[PDB]
Amino acid sequence: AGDTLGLTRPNESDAPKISIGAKDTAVVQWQGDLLAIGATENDMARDENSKFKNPLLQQLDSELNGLLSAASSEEDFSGKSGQSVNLRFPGGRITLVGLGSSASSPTSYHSLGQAAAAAAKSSQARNIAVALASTDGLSAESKINSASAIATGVVLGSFEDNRFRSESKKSTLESLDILGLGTGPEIERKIKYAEHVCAGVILGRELVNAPANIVTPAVLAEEAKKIASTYSDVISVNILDAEQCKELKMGAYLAVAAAATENPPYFIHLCFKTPTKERKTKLALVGKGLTFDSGELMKNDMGGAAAVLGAAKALGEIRPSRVEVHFIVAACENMISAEGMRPGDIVTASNGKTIEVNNTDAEGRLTLADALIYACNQGVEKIIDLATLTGAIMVALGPSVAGAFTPNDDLAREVVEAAEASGEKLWRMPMEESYWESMKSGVADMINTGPGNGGAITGALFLKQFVDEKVQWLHLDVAGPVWSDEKKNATGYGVSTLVEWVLRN
Amino acid sequence: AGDTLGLTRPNESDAPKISIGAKDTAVVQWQGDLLAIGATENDMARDENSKFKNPLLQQLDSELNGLLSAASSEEDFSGKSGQSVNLRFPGGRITLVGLGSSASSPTSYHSLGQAAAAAAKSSQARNIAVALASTDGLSAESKINSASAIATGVVLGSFEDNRFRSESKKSTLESLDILGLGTGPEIERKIKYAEHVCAGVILGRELVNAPANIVTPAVLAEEAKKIASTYSDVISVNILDAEQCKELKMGAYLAVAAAATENPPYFIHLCFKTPTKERKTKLALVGKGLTFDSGLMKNDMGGAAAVLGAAKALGEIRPSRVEVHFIVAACENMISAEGMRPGDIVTASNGKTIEVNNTDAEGRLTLADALIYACNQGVEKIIDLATLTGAIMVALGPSVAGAFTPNDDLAREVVEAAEASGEKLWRMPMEESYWESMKSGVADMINTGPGNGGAITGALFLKQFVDEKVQWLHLDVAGPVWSDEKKNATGYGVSTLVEWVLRN
Amino acid sequence: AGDTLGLTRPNESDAPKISIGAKDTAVVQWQGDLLAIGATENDMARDENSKFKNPLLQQLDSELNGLLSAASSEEDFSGKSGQSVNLRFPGGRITLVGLGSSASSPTSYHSLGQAAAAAAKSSQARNIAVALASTDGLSAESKINSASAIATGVVLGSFEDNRFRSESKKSTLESLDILGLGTGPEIERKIKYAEHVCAGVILGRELVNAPANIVTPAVLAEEAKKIASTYSDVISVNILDAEQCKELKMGAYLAVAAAATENPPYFIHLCFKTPTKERKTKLALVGKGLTFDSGLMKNDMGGAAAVLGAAKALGEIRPSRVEVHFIVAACENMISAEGMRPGDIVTASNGKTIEVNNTDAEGRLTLADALIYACNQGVEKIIDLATLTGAIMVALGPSVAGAFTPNDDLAREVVEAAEASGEKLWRMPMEESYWESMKSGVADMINTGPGNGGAITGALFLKQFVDEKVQWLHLDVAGPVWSDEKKNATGYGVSTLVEWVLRN
Amino acid sequence: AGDTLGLTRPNESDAPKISIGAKDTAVVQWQGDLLAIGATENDMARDENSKFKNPLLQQLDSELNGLLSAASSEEDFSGKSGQSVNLRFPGGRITLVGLGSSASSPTSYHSLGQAAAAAAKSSQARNIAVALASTDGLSAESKINSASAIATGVVLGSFEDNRFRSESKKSTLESLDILGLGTGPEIERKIKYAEHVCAGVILGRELVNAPANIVTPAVLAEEAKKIASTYSDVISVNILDAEQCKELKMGAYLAVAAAATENPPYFIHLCFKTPTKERKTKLALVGKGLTFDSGLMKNDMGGAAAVLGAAKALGEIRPSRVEVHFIVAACENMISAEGMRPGDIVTASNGKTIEVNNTDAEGRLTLADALIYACNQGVEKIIDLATLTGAIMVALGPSVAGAFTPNDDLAREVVEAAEASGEKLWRMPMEESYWESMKSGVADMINTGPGNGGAITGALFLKQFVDEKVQWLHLDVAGPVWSDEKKNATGYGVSTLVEWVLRN
């Protein structure tokens, strides 16, 4: 760690790959450390004698001589969302997990998986199983989708980032058997898909969790190269250095980067494409990549870049045809030094527009200006950018819901549908044109920061100045959901939605 | 652009030089795109048939068959200050501009000229004229002065700084005929004088409008060199680098400059004099030149701008009875490992020590060494201009500068100069009893006193660095160098300084 | 002062070494410029004729024909703490100083000595004396301790730091005779001890009064080397540079130091011991040594100053039976491109990781590595002094330091040492339940907890870097190292630390 | 709820009285819903076959065929503080609760009892038991104290205040058997004592949890009258209204109360004593009783609540050898036309004048008159409790109260009482030099000093109203009266005050 500030050396991530499979084993006959069962409120109904009506629960309780029904009533478990009962008995352990009533997939089944991972961690389980108390009326396909969402919840719920702390226990969880939901090639493909996405989500969490003295712009570029190296027959990489970006006239990006002489900036360009020669839709994913932003209360730095690189990691495995995807991150750290940009400075973006920098706490959007111009210059048809852009969007939508801004109603609809499929939370917000007048400069084409009221909107209107009108473009302000204050950890928010969006194109 | 942070390049200022002349042409006979008429409230009086009493306005109206009087009453124009009517008719365009009642020159005539420029801009006028509705009761001198003030308004009102905008429209205005106020050599000399002063005001606006990534200290020094090069027979230049200032023991200035290793400091010294060898009154003009101040301050370097603006004007005017030293200790106040910390104790070139209790008041540290330097040139009188305090804006608002001097006579000179230029300033007291609040427990003084009286203690601080045999006045111009309404620099100070120099 | 920022050059200190002695001379027979007398309220009792009952005061008044009793009653002097009467008469000058009632020693005697110094300074006295109005009810040992405390007050009271200002007169005080409190070898050894401690206290004041552009980390290292050089038979020095600290894995200290590329860091290690071979208790004194802290606070480096002060005193006193390690991890906390960011995770030399959630609390990071280094020297007991928190001043005010230890015995030793020194400190609890608020979501801990309990969690942080086998006390001295009343450093801590070392 | 603001009506509390007893029943033979076992880390040691070495745990595990040891290791339970395992099996339920290593009693046993209550609540248990895994090395007396502490944890842990919300289930807990710690009259008397103290602690929690629109000063007086009525042979009451306090010259208290014309003030005086005629030590307990303070802080009235709590406990316990005065000057601090302004000068009932420079510190004005009233009852010792300052929370965090006294003996009594009660407090210094910052330019004193030292100067203020012949300690309880974690009042202070009274 000789050249790392603070001499910090990340511990080697020693997480096992969980072995996940869908089995036809009867639930009452399954043997291992922990069985988790997802039950709705209706699944917990009892008869005249206070016995479970549900066949699976009735049988498990019988075999336990009424210990499961007794514990459940004593502990007031009736299958409400978030509730759980944990029962250790001779030969095994059962946890019932409440699904509530009328809970949406995939989110309910993600939660179920998360709860199963938590109960595994708290009992040092190695081999676990998950099932639903009832699958009546469900198609083979809904069941497949529930299985893959359960898998996702277990994998993401088992992740623990211990790279920067001296005391930790490695995860005990080695296998997951998903029961009752089908077997064979199709359900296994879907589980594999989920696993590919999770590996992207987990990369995103790691990139964000890591502090700026570890994930520098040069380190972020190396992560990009590692993805390309792993998937070199479908992903290529081009890393531009400051001098190359200067030749491309990226004055807004380079001005933000100028202070940080010790950790130089790198402009990251990955391109995914299968070598086959059918028609491909050309897409870009642009992520804000300030590895530190001068403007540890805000632990969301780089969430956007992380979601973009996480998506690349997923897509490298999934290998969709019919799409060409450009992943673009203008990476730098925003520091303070004699070589730095001052408030009031006027910088020129690579499309010639001039920006009066009235607020040095909003420098991220400057880097995005040049990244968006670059994306448009790759000849893409559609762009999504993700950025932790404003506090204002968290005032508006809270910690958990990202704001989506687009001139293009169709692309809004695509992104809303992708989020519905992934389970991620977002909400379209208006690009109210009248607010652009508040962004006028008395010397330059525009200022970089408008009034507090409307701030997430004028942030979006700012970015629009750097997007070719013929390209469809949506901006996702993810300041809130990239970081979980409760878990004190990154989420990798965005990856799953982006993957779904690419795949549905 | 290549070596500029943000890759930003100033667009070439493409503005035409307006052709200005005084002409004897009767106002009703004049032909061109726009005729602007300045009318007082009394000039707009009407008779019992609602017809203008004023002979010029009566004639124009009757020639337009009552269209001008009708439009005027409909639009409630009665000649009040700020009022205007704009009438397009076959063969031309007239705008009447209200002058109010008993309004002071040159400000009223500046405003008239500004209003004419604005009406030109909004009609794309190329050739305009301006006249007063009545000139009777004005001396030949006052008419001359009115003409030059009109010219000033039109020139300054036509200026638009589009250097950093990727889209803009070039001024259409090409010529101004000033009517009814006299013709011949004298009025033409006065108009030319106004033009020379405007070019200095406009340089000042440009220096301030430009951001710190464009106007660095090196660039400020180049602008000084360019003035000397343009007027080389009357203006000389010496630019001192950090190592030269160090030999001159400028520890206060060099401490402030120490952080900014990327944009090194330059100490600017221009000297104006005509090349004849008669005795000349020796003056200095010192301007605060922090191209950026770490402590939105869009008024940074307003002082230095006014000082260089004055040089530019004087280089053209060539006054014979004066030797003027223009002095700017230019640097940017940044943050870095090489920088001065709060608490540091720095030593000015006169040997006095300063405890720097507040790094938002570093400007005055640079002025300390600039003032000592000025006194060392052997001058008789110094004016410094500086955006020194927020306190002065609390005291006097955005539009009126504060003037501080121990020397009553110099105060009177500067008040008279501002009366002649039209600029707003107000003397403030150098209340001695407040010096006690500037005591240090370790050094000779601290740099920043309490908020109450802050502009006064700022002045008292500077007075520590001025030879008491030299007459010295400090002008705290934090407010009026920048117009929040126009979102632009004003070039405040240039016209007053030039009038001050000339009256010496 | 070519390489000093601001070109500041400290003036050469010209303080007299005061000649101090204890004499058996009758107070009324003593000859010189000023006689100061310490009188309690009870000492000032008068009889039925309004004459002093105190024998000494009665005698002096009788010599002055009632002038002293008359001046006293007119000026309402009754011996209350802080009161004084100053009477100039033919052949000399007397000042009576109030000691109050049941005031604690040595503080009451320090104050006496300070008041005698102040009266000497205000009358330009060269030769002075001090006596108590009454020594009834005092042991020989208490009188000896009173005498040395009076000497301490006079020496410290006569100090004036004029290194950074032009206007000063050198102290006139040349001698002090202490009367009525005994004579001979023992009292003289005590006075000498007090003098040695004062020279340390004065070094401490100087190191703190000097600004960060003068006392950089290199300069602080040179001060350490000078101490070792002066006392080279009992004090050794090792200065470690950044590369050596990196080999010792001091990632927390080096992270804080990384920004300040212009003034590099030095880790200072002094060791005191007499060359005799009796068993020695191994002690460490660790001082926070941020010469400037980016998080006007004038208390920077008060901890390091106390530690180096103590070394200076101990070098002269030469106690046997101790080996004392003096450890200061010196650096300045600046802002640059090379600097640590908030959120960075740094690794101390014991392997523990710290998530730096607040860059205003970097001082404790340097102490982490200093404390580990101290434990690695195999010491039995450590005291650290550090200006660690604002919270401790909220808690205990400007004058009383907070003491934090797991070790009840060491608390008792430090409380007793302060009792003997006269310095004010108070033990505060290391409430363990607060450690939970120092959890990180990524590292082993954060560096800053919530405001409530901030001095406690500061202490609990430091505890993570201290071997449990070692007894350890943390002293948060943010308040008393700097006197806002004097506008000067106090050298707080030196006298206590010397008493602690001596009582081991 | 016609006359209550907001029409709020407290729901009737329906808490079971838990039946508590000590039994000699072998733990393995005990029958009921839930058995909780307190185990230290050392208790959880295993042998070479991974079987519990502890005899009780070995036996229980053997009955459960290894299920308990297996669940324990799987769930990483090793007996650390806060840890727990909960195992439901045929015929019952066991919970193992970690006690950590060398944790102090009674706190460790309180926590045990709280964890047993929580497990009862989460499993709807009616009949529970608690035992220690090991009682080796405990005296009979320590076991008795452990049992009563366990009872206290269970009773306090089972409390839930549902008066102001619609959704709640009544506690299922009906009985507790305490096992392994002894049987018979002595242990039963101790348990009974703990129950009496709990009923006080619970009254305290209720008085604080209730909002100011429910617990007004009139209502607080009625609570006092209810206590006296319940225990009328040992507790008498006198409620003084505003007019009576005016005759007693309580200008400081009445000034604070003047704004609140809608909810008038009442001065509460309870007196406890048994009717037997042995010598009784006269004590006062004074509580701050601002039912609302205009200066969301949920700690209002925590002091008064502790005092009334103590009266409730003492009414049942009936100690001989004491007479205890319980004094609360109750009012609300509001804003109206009738109110006190900042700057007003008020006169306390001892004649001293106070310039009220800060209306956020009015609570101390009411205490001034309460303390004078207490001294006028001829008591020997006074403790006041008050949520006086934010400063004390900065100092000591949320959990530890600050204790201020001139009287070293009383400090020792209160520190010992807290030791016995388990409550956290810490003595802080009454640094006399800070009194100078409380000077007024017009009155005898101001009411608020500078932020630094604010808890100390608070104490020094209160001292002005205390007869020096009376021993007096001030407890600043701003932190621990309210638990942000529970979102509920704690009734902090009651148990300590009861122990203090009993040890007199």
Ligand SMILES: [Cl-]
């Ligand atoms: Cl981002």
Ligand SMILES: [Cl-]
């Ligand atoms: Cl931004």
Ligand SMILES: [Cl-]
């Ligand atoms: Cl929509």
Ligand SMILES: [Cl-]
């Ligand atoms: Cl300026």
Ligand SMILES: [Cl-]
């Ligand atoms: Cl300044």
Ligand SMILES: [Cl-]
């Ligand atoms: Cl320190």
Ligand SMILES: [Cl-]
């Ligand atoms: Cl710190």
Ligand SMILES: [Cl-]
């Ligand atoms: Cl101990």
Ligand SMILES: [Cl-]
């Ligand atoms: Cl209270």
Ligand SMILES: [Cl-]
């Ligand atoms: Cl209060």
Ligand SMILES: [Cl-]
């Ligand atoms: Cl005492």
Ligand SMILES: [Mg+2]
């Ligand atoms: Mg698999």
Ligand SMILES: [Mg+2]
């Ligand atoms: Mg990070």
Ligand SMILES: [Mg+2]
């Ligand atoms: Mg012309």
Ligand SMILES: [Mg+2]
């Ligand atoms: Mg500018």
Ligand SMILES: [Mg+2]
């Ligand atoms: Mg001597």
